[PDB]
Design a protein around this motif. Structure first.
Motif, PDB file in Angstrom:
ATOM      1  N   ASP A 302      32.448 -53.379   8.130  1.00 28.01           N
ATOM      2  CA  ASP A 302      32.312 -54.259   6.940  1.00 28.01           C
ATOM      3  C   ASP A 302      33.650 -54.735   6.351  1.00 28.01           C
ATOM      4  OD1 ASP A 302      29.538 -53.573   7.486  1.00 28.01           O
ATOM      5  OD2 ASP A 302      29.034 -54.181   5.402  1.00 28.01           O
ATOM      6  N   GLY A 303      34.591 -55.022   7.255  1.00 26.13           N
ATOM      7  CA  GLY A 303      35.892 -55.564   6.863  1.00 26.13           C
ATOM      8  C   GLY A 303      36.770 -54.569   6.113  1.00 26.13           C
ATOM      9  N   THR A 304      36.437 -53.269   6.218  1.00 28.04           N
ATOM     10  CA  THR A 304      37.331 -52.165   5.753  1.00 28.04           C
ATOM     11  C   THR A 304      37.964 -51.466   6.963  1.00 28.04           C
ATOM     12  OG1 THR A 304      35.811 -51.764   3.874  1.00 28.04           O
ATOM     13  CG2 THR A 304      37.613 -50.102   4.244  1.00 28.04           C
ATOM     14  N   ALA A 305      39.246 -51.119   6.797  1.00 24.85           N
ATOM     15  CA  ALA A 305      40.079 -50.516   7.846  1.00 24.85           C
ATOM     16  C   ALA A 305      39.975 -48.960   7.976  1.00 24.85           C
ATOM     17  CB  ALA A 305      41.565 -50.967   7.683  1.00 24.85           C
ATOM     18  N   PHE A 306      39.235 -48.502   9.011  1.00 22.15           N
ATOM     19  CA  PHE A 306      39.041 -47.073   9.293  1.00 22.15           C
ATOM     20  C   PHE A 306      39.801 -46.626  10.553  1.00 22.15           C
ATOM     21  CE2 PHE A 306      36.667 -46.328   5.633  1.00 22.15           C
ATOM     22  CZ  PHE A 306      35.736 -47.358   5.462  1.00 22.15           C
ATOM     23  N   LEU A 307      40.023 -45.318  10.687  1.00 28.67           N
ATOM     24  CA  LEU A 307      40.580 -44.815  11.929  1.00 28.67           C
ATOM     25  C   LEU A 307      39.646 -43.770  12.570  1.00 28.67           C
ATOM     26  CD1 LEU A 307      43.492 -45.141  13.362  1.00 28.67           C
ATOM     27  CD2 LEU A 307      44.005 -42.964  12.273  1.00 28.67           C
ATOM     28  N   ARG A 308      39.144 -44.058  13.733  1.00 34.72           N
ATOM     29  CA  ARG A 308      38.461 -43.070  14.499  1.00 34.72           C
ATOM     30  C   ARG A 308      39.439 -42.039  15.088  1.00 34.72           C
ATOM     31  NH1 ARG A 308      33.338 -45.357  15.912  1.00 34.72           N
ATOM     32  NH2 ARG A 308      33.942 -45.839  18.106  1.00 34.72           N
ATOM     33  N   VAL A 309      39.190 -40.757  14.807  1.00 36.65           N
ATOM     34  CA  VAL A 309      39.943 -39.633  15.415  1.00 36.65           C
ATOM     35  C   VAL A 309      39.014 -38.598  16.072  1.00 36.65           C
ATOM     36  CG1 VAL A 309      41.955 -39.937  13.814  1.00 36.65           C
ATOM     37  CG2 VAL A 309      40.044 -38.174  13.264  1.00 36.65           C
ATOM     38  N   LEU A 310      39.556 -37.621  16.787  1.00 36.62           N
ATOM     39  CA  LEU A 310      38.699 -36.547  17.295  1.00 36.62           C
ATOM     40  C   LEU A 310      38.105 -35.679  16.161  1.00 36.62           C
ATOM     41  CD1 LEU A 310      40.683 -35.813  20.370  1.00 36.62           C
ATOM     42  CD2 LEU A 310      38.273 -36.484  20.343  1.00 36.62           C
ATOM     43  N   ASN A 311      36.860 -35.242  16.306  1.00 35.48           N
ATOM     44  CA  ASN A 311      36.190 -34.408  15.287  1.00 35.48           C
ATOM     45  C   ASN A 311      36.917 -33.052  15.242  1.00 35.48           C
ATOM     46  OD1 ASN A 311      33.961 -36.123  14.717  1.00 35.48           O
ATOM     47  ND2 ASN A 311      32.502 -35.031  16.162  1.00 35.48           N
ATOM     48  N   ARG A 312      37.018 -32.468  14.064  1.00 31.26           N
ATOM     49  CA  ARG A 312      37.463 -31.108  13.953  1.00 31.26           C
ATOM     50  C   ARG A 312      36.272 -30.143  14.199  1.00 31.26           C
ATOM     51  N   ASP A 313      36.562 -28.864  14.309  1.00 31.19           N
ATOM     52  CA  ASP A 313      35.524 -27.909  14.585  1.00 31.19           C
ATOM     53  C   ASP A 313      34.682 -27.725  13.364  1.00 31.19           C
ATOM     54  OD1 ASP A 313      36.601 -27.473  17.125  1.00 31.19           O
ATOM     55  OD2 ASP A 313      37.154 -25.421  16.732  1.00 31.19           O
ATOM     56  N   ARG A 314      33.527 -27.106  13.523  1.00 29.90           N
ATOM     57  CA  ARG A 314      32.606 -26.997  12.420  1.00 29.90           C
ATOM     58  C   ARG A 314      32.468 -25.555  11.891  1.00 29.90           C
ATOM     59  NH1 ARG A 314      29.226 -31.866  13.267  1.00 29.90           N
ATOM     60  NH2 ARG A 314      27.478 -30.865  12.174  1.00 29.90           N
ATOM     61  N   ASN A 315      32.751 -25.376  10.591  1.00 27.62           N
ATOM     62  CA  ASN A 315      32.704 -24.067   9.906  1.00 27.62           C
ATOM     63  C   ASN A 315      31.346 -23.696   9.317  1.00 27.62           C
ATOM     64  OD1 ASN A 315      35.824 -23.447  10.104  1.00 27.62           O
ATOM     65  ND2 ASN A 315      35.582 -25.563   9.369  1.00 27.62           N
ATOM     66  N   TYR A 316      30.881 -22.492   9.662  1.00 29.78           N
ATOM     67  CA  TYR A 316      29.583 -21.988   9.198  1.00 29.78           C
ATOM     68  C   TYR A 316      29.642 -20.573   8.615  1.00 29.78           C
ATOM     69  CZ  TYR A 316      27.810 -25.950  11.800  1.00 29.78           C
ATOM     70  OH  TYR A 316      27.536 -27.212  12.275  1.00 29.78           O
ATOM     71  N   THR A 317      28.626 -20.223   7.811  1.00 29.81           N
ATOM     72  CA  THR A 317      28.407 -18.830   7.443  1.00 29.81           C
ATOM     73  C   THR A 317      27.370 -18.223   8.376  1.00 29.81           C
ATOM     74  OG1 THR A 317      28.930 -19.404   5.182  1.00 29.81           O
ATOM     75  CG2 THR A 317      28.076 -17.185   5.512  1.00 29.81           C
ATOM     76  N   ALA A 318      27.709 -17.087   8.960  1.00 31.29           N
ATOM     77  CA  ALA A 318      26.736 -16.330   9.718  1.00 31.29           C
ATOM     78  C   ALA A 318      25.543 -15.919   8.849  1.00 31.29           C
ATOM     79  CB  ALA A 318      27.396 -15.050  10.423  1.00 31.29           C
ATOM     80  N   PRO A 319      24.357 -15.855   9.483  1.00 27.55           N
ATOM     81  CA  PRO A 319      23.209 -15.294   8.736  1.00 27.55           C
ATOM     82  C   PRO A 319      23.571 -14.025   7.888  1.00 27.55           C
ATOM     83  CG  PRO A 319      22.678 -15.624  11.092  1.00 27.55           C
ATOM     84  CD  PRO A 319      24.021 -16.230  10.865  1.00 27.55           C
ATOM     85  N   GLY A 320      24.273 -13.066   8.482  1.00 24.97           N
ATOM     86  CA  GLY A 320      24.680 -11.855   7.773  1.00 24.97           C
ATOM     87  C   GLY A 320      25.923 -11.986   6.895  1.00 24.97           C
ATOM     88  N   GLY A 321      26.395 -13.224   6.706  1.00 22.04           N
ATOM     89  CA  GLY A 321      27.494 -13.517   5.763  1.00 22.04           C
ATOM     90  C   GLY A 321      28.928 -13.771   6.239  1.00 22.04           C
ATOM     91  N   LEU A 326      31.934 -23.388  15.310  1.00 20.80           N
ATOM     92  CA  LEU A 326      31.485 -24.097  16.541  1.00 20.80           C
ATOM     93  C   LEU A 326      32.347 -25.322  16.870  1.00 20.80           C
ATOM     94  CD1 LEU A 326      27.599 -23.963  16.106  1.00 20.80           C
ATOM     95  CD2 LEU A 326      29.079 -22.348  17.406  1.00 20.80           C
ATOM     96  N   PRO A 327      32.645 -25.553  18.172  1.00 19.38           N
ATOM     97  CA  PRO A 327      33.476 -26.733  18.633  1.00 19.38           C
ATOM     98  C   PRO A 327      32.988 -28.111  18.138  1.00 19.38           C
ATOM     99  CG  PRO A 327      32.332 -25.738  20.483  1.00 19.38           C
ATOM    100  CD  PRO A 327      32.250 -24.721  19.326  1.00 19.38           C
ATOM    101  N   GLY A 328      33.893 -28.970  17.723  1.00 22.36           N
ATOM    102  CA  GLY A 328      33.511 -30.236  17.136  1.00 22.36           C
ATOM    103  C   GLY A 328      33.374 -31.286  18.218  1.00 22.36           C
ATOM    104  N   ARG A 329      33.893 -30.961  19.405  1.00 22.67           N
ATOM    105  CA  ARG A 329      34.090 -31.926  20.506  1.00 22.67           C
ATOM    106  C   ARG A 329      33.439 -31.449  21.760  1.00 22.67           C
ATOM    107  NH1 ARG A 329      38.070 -29.681  20.952  1.00 22.67           N
ATOM    108  NH2 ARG A 329      37.761 -28.628  18.935  1.00 22.67           N
ATOM    109  N   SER A 330      32.933 -32.367  22.556  1.00 17.50           N
ATOM    110  CA  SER A 330      32.303 -31.956  23.775  1.00 17.50           C
ATOM    111  C   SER A 330      33.422 -31.478  24.736  1.00 17.50           C
ATOM    112  CB  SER A 330      31.573 -33.175  24.389  1.00 17.50           C
ATOM    113  OG  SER A 330      32.565 -33.887  25.041  1.00 17.50           O
ATOM    114  N   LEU A 331      33.107 -30.573  25.679  1.00 17.85           N
ATOM    115  CA  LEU A 331      34.077 -30.192  26.675  1.00 17.85           C
ATOM    116  C   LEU A 331      34.319 -31.345  27.629  1.00 17.85           C
ATOM    117  CD1 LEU A 331      33.963 -26.966  28.926  1.00 17.85           C
ATOM    118  CD2 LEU A 331      34.217 -29.149  29.872  1.00 17.85           C
TER     119      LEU A 331
END
Ligand SMILES: CC(C)(COP(=O)(O)OP(=O)(O)OC[C@H]1O[C@@H](n2cnc3c(N)ncnc32)[C@H](O)[C@@H]1OP(=O)(O)O)[C@@H](O)C(=O)NCCC(=O)NCCS
Ligand SMILES: [Mg+2]
Ligand SMILES: [Mg+2]
Length: 720
Positions: A302-321, A326-331
């Motif tokens: 939409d005529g706005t200037a963005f930069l595509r970069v590689l995804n960073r990894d994804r941070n989660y809480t384990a069920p037990g806390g 998990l990897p952000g990028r496919s192998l």
């Protein structure tokens, strides 16, 4: 000869500088030693590369001649193939030993995306496609018909978005059932005593299998997301009551994210056009930014200037806390070219060009070192937890050619100062001499192989060329039903599973080429995991996320245990040539369709150096075209021509019929230059003509010699 001499090599400057200035630093390899190993490796392996190419030529001429002396006696034919060394004996049973392989390969069943490495924008997107929105995939495609007011428009259409939500709710029910009730009636989610608790109108419920709860984000009592797992693939429900979709949702659910393209193949081969040192430097640089983690591409929404970069990894809480990631990028695999072509990026003293497949190992091996560690100089990305580099080797003919790849990798590992067997091989099963000797091919690579994959398009191209002289073949859309291809597919799975691939290596199947027809993909492409394939190829992120659905429905590990050690295909089936028993409207349609698809693909290859295009066929079906779909069209026509079903004049007339149509399809591309009406001043038109009229003369029916020569012609003419 802006060329730097090193030993007997004359290295193009642009390559030399890229290697020394960009690729080498941070790899701890001494550059002088690098270059002297390039020299030694090229001098030692070239004569065997040439000998293996000569053998393909020798085998084909014998086959041509056999057919020309000759209703096929299949016993006599098998025998002849045994005598000339085409069909070799099947080895004793074994199990592959490959080790140091990531779980995305040994264990996780799921989609595999392929992408042209020269296109940074797409290559980034593909690496980022391990994680994709199911809502966007459903809303943006024909999976959800535009029926009963569900048509896409300028604005979010709630009738359509409600259909998407329902489709996703049912998917959640099927993949991760609650103990009681449906996700369709969920009002909210919490984490209690380390369990997922789903709030209903009655009723709170856990999951029928609580091991499918993988973690969450945000506060336990009010999570921003819930991560689930099924068949080793993750599903993330994003919760946001305040999002545009969320406010309309009963549980304030904003999206469902599927883990999709667990692996991705960064392609140097059939999806790219790279004919000289400048082109190869472009792709090696993109391969470099991927492994370093710093590749980027400016993107406009939409005529706005963005930069595509590689995804960073994804941070989660384990069920037990506890916290985890998990990897952000496919192998990432990288697909090198095969054994055939040379490239002028390096020539020797006599100006002979160096085999490109030898260079690809050296250079893509070298650059892959950066993704084996994280540092300032290597960049933050790590591509493999186990230290493996993953290379798809296409278009090999038989076990000797596999052993030669493995020897190439071994030689390269010594140059790069890497342990032996660092460089893994994904073997394309896409040439007939590989199919009918597939177990020996696996065997030749038993300590390196991480996949086999039915490259059915190339495989059909070889099928047509191999039996060129036997008679006219069936129409290309009639190939899918021929015994050779049905046996080929089962045989590939049989051989991988008998070699112990289950739990160790992918058994992969081919590409869905109808980029727009996703409802069809979702209905049909489920057959591939049901046949035991732990992975199959998809043309886009959107298609990955959609194909992932199939890995939730089919338990491929259970399929594979139920097929393992069972022989389903016979040699005789594998060798049954797709000879025809046509009305002129049927010949016209076949020829015009083949011509249209050839022209529409070649014109952007030659004029623009685009090696993968979307090209409507005669029925307006948007098809992904690459060299392999080209190999089939140009070989089928060369075969019709060879046997007098069509004449040269026929081909020319068809090509003239369809050129103006391709020109129309391409108008509104400001960079396009039409082929019509001056067909003979069009290098791209002449390429398409040459691919057909010289087709029978091309080694194994390969398109690269004519395409590389014609694209270079075109560059040279664009230069003066
Ligand atoms: C057929 C193909 C050329 C279609 O792309 P197209 O005609 O240029 O353009 P489309 O409008 O359909 O798609 C472009 C968008 O989809 C994405 N896209 C399409 N194919 C992609 C792929 N393989 N990987 C990542 N993104 C892809 C693009 O990144 C772009 O999205 P963006 O605007 O956010 O950057 C293409 O899907 C492709 O080059 N890739 C896969 C094919 C392949 O590698 N092997 C050949 C098999 S026949
Ligand atoms: Mg790194
Ligand atoms: Mg192929």
């Amino acid at each position: 000869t802006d060329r730097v001499s090193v030993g007997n090599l004359r290295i193009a400057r642009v390559l030399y500088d890229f290697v020394n200035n960009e690729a080498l630093p941070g790899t701890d390899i001494d550059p002088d030693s690098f270059w002297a190993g390039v020299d030694k490796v090229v001098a030692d392996l070239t004569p065997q590369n040439q000998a293996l190419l000569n053998a393909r030529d020798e085998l084909q001429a014998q086959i041509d001649k056999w057919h020309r002396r000759r209703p096929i006696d299949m016993d006599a034919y098998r025998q002849f193939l045994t005598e000339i060394g085409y069909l070799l004996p099947e080895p004793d049973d074994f199990t592959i030993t490959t080790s140091g392989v990531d779980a995305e390969i040994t264990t996780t069943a799921g989609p595999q995306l392929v992408v042209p490495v020269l296109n940074a924008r797409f290559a980034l997107n593909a690496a980022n496609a391990r994680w994709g929105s199911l809502y966007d995939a459903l809303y943006g495609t024909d999976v959800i018909p535009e029926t009963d007011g569900a048509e896409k428009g300028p604005t979010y259409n709630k009738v359509r978005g409600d259909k998407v939500i329902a489709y996703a709710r049912k998917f959640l029910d099927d993949s991760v059932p609650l103990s009681s009730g449906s996700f369709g009636d969920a009002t909210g989610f919490t984490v209690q005593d380390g369990q997922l608790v789903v709030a209903l109108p009655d009723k709170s419920t856990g999951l029928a299998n609580p091991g499918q709860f993988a973690g969450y984000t945000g506060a336990a009592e009010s999570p921003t997301s819930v991560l689930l797992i099924n068949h080793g693939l993750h599903i993330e429900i994003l919760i946001d009551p305040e999002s545009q979709v969320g406010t309309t949702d009963r549980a304030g659910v904003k999206d469902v994210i599927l883990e999709s393209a667990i692996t991705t193949i960064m392609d140097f081969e059939d999806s790219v056009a790279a004919v000289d040192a400048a082109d190869k430097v472009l792709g090696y640089r993109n391969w470099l930014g991927l492994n370093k983690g710093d590749l980027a591409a400016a993107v406009d929404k939409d005529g706005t200037a963005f930069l595509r970069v590689l995804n960073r990894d994804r941070n989660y809480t384990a069920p037990g806390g506890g916290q985890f990631t998990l990897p952000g990028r496919s192998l990432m695999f990288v697909r090198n070219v095969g054994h055939l072509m040379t490239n002028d990026a390096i020539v020797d003293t006599d100006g002979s060009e160096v085999f490109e497949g030898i260079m690809d190992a050296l250079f893509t091996g070298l650059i892959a070192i950066h993704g084996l560690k994280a540092s300032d100089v290597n960049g933050p990305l790590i591509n493999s937890r186990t230290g493996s580099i993953y290379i798809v080797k296409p278009k090999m003919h038989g076990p000797a050619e596999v052993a030669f790849t493995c020897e190439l990798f071994s030689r390269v590992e010594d140059v790069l100062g890497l342990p032996q067997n660092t460089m893994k091989i994904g073997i394309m099963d896409e040439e007939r001499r590989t199919t009918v000797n597939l177990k020996a091919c696996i065997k030749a690579a038993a300590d390196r192989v991480v996949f086999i994959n039915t490259g059915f398009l190339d495989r059909t191209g070889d099928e047509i060329h191999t039996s060129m002289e036997a008679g006219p073949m069936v129409r290309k859309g009639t190939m899918k039903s021929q015994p050779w291809i049905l046996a080929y597919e089962d045989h590939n799975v049989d051989a991988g599973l008998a070699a112990g691939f289950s739990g160790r290596a992918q058994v992969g199947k081919g590409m869905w080429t109808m980029t727009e027809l996703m409802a069809d993909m979702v209905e049909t492409k489920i057959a591939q995991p049901r046949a035991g394939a732990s992975t199959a190829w998809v043309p886009s992120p959107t298609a990955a996320t959609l194909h992932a659905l199939h890995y939730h429905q089919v338990d491929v590990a259970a399929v594979q245990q139920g097929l393992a050690g069972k022989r389903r295909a016979t040699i005789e089936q594998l060798l049954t040539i797709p000879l025809a028993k046509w009305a002129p409207d049927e010949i016209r349609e076949e020829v015009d369709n083949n011509c249209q698809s050839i022209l529409g693909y070649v014109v952007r290859w030659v004029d623009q150096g685009v090696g993968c295009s979307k090209v409507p066929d005669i029925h307006d079906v948007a098809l992904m075209e690459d060299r392999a779909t080209l190999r089939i069209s140009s070989q089928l026509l060369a075969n019709w021509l060879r046997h007098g079903v069509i004449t040269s004049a026929d081909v020319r007339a068809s090509l003239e019929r369809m050129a103006p149509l391709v020109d129309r399809q391409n108008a509104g591309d400001v960079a396009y230059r039409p082929m019509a009406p001056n067909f003979d001043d069009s290098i791209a038109f002449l390429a398409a003509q040459e691919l057909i009229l010289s087709g029978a003369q091309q080694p194994n029916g390969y398109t690269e010699p004519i395409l590389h020569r014609r694209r270079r012609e075109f560059k040279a003419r664009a230069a003066e």
